[PDB]
Amino acid sequence: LIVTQTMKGLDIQKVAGTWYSLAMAASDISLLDAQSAPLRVYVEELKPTPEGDLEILLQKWENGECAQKKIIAEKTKIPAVFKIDALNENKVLVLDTDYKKYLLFCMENSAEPEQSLACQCLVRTPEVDDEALEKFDKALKALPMHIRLSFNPTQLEEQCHI
Template sequence: MALLLLSLGLSLVSAQELNPRAIVRKSYDMAKVSGVWYSVSMASDDMKRIEENGDLRVFIRNIESLKDGGLRFHFLFMVHGECVQVAMVCERTEKDGEYAVSYEGDNKVLLLETDYKLYITFHLRNIRNGTDTNVLALYVCRKYGLGPQNIISLSNQNTCFKYKK
């Protein structure tokens, strides 16, 4: 079901000015990934990890390409019932578009697809205590109508923010 929602989200986002020739699936220019992005949808093979209070439930705010080739992600997520902003640096691996970070286990973050302007998708593989968890995440750029004006803070209701209807 979650994968269906992720696909639907990508379909709706891509209906706006999508140019199939502009879609990048390899040889990424990470400097073009830098900027403000907003979480649209997540899917996982362990839904408990991305549901409310899940340790992998994060809402992205910004991605920075670093001079050393790494990426800095700025997230919002729940800590002890409070919505907090956290920056996490991922180190580049030898694989194109792949980054490593230690958080709740060993993680590989792989950029799957982007057009640098409209959307970006990531695959997170988390290995913790011998358990392998996969998360797919879809983010969109603020230029296409999704931004703070479409989000309301619900930090007192056990979630960082939720999209307005």
């Protein structure tokens, strides 16, 4: 609920398939600065269940190499918001998507201390999409980000964007 842009009328079935993590931003540099930083995750695929939960396939660098990870995001009463559960119960919020080209999401830790908030611009192809990046940057202008990364088409085709 730090982020107050939410996709009205989200049809979670339609975000299925392959995505590319074109850009990332976080409120804390340490969340994204190294290959093995904790929210440096490269989205591969979204797999919505029939009950409306969301299976997530991603990569993450750990122990000197690019590892595949599977993650379950459970639905809530709000169609745009999901919970990772696991250790801290992180919420994931879909800000905006048009399903066939881009999707903007943010995630926050359900409490703090020092605020942890990270967002991504996903796109459907290995292409720099200026319009989506522009919407991403607009979405974030009033959020307190201190690190922003983006990736070139070559990196997007490589595991962990190396």
